[PDB]
Amino acid sequence: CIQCGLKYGQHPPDAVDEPQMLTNEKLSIFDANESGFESYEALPQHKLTCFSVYCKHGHLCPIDTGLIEKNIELFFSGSAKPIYDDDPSLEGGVNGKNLGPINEWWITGFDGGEKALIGFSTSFAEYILMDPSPEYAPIFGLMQEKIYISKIVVEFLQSNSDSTYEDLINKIETTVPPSGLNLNRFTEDSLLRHAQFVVEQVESYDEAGDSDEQPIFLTPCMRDLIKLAGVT
Amino acid sequence: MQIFVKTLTGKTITLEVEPSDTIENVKAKIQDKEGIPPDQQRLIFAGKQLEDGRTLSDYNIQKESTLHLVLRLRGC
Amino acid sequence: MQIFVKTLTGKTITLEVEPSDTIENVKAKIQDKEGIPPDQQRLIFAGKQLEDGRTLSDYNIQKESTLHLVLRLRGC
């Protein structure tokens, strides 16, 4: 494909486009008043479940293979839900189709909490992902391990500036992998095979920090990792 | 009384509060415990975002209620 | 006549409008009051996106109707 580069993208018959979806009352999170709650520059932010990402003409696609950086337009479908919702079913959602295109995707939740969170940014809204559709689920799962390792690394460097590479590996090896990843344990190679991505996530997290909190890039752990894994 | 504040990752914070505390006060206690600036914090209860000047009594936030904490994220 | 415009940021806007006003005219009124360029505005009523070039009477929109404003940011 001139966009892509096999499964195909479907959606319920009641799905609507992005602006119509965002005004559904199920997603109303404010009791509106004369002053407003958020800036006009802030995108509305919702959960999105049963999601699937596809190219400008139909094929399910990954998002981490460089298509986004080649400015290919990836659209997505799914059921938008209130931002606080933890139920990944379609229940209480609003089906949307041809959302986007994805301008940016990102990782958040460096909380110490259980979940790694993935988000999409469009020109209308931001979406924190819950469960992929059954037919997009194989593609989405390929990415999940490096996402979660990035979370552990950032969180360990946040809370252990004075720590060492071996202590980071011990944290990785003792972190029980979350369900649905279908692995018994993380291993030192879980970090090394994904080291370029992980290091890029750490530095992007550093860049988003305010110019008055301690960086995490320039650490003993990272320079060992950059050396040991050949990171550019 | 104790209330809980749950983030989107599932992380749960326990706070000590009184029904007369304002949402502004609760955001300050979240800052105290977690370091998050109040200007990043959106608190949600019973499906609605909460207003800084109103109190826990105004919203019927009760002992061991859970508030949802959503953050205005820093990013590049 | 008076209509309302509710945003996705929790604001309710009051406008002075005529049945013969086009959707573009309504967006210009929102620009006058909130500073939002009309090309970044989408107006939804009862599930339906309101199209430029139609009037409020074309959509049979009556006094005290509440329109729903969705913004498309410029760039990213």
């Binding site: 998002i63 940016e104 988000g119 909190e213 | 370091g35 | -």
Partner: peptide, 19 residues
């Protein structure tokens, strides 16, 4: 307790995006 902002890391961004 020390300031700690809530952040996202960028997984991917289209070159169309300037900010």
């Amino acid at each position: 307790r020390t300031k700690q902002t809530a952040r996202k890391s960028t997984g991917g961004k289209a070159p169309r995006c300037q900010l």
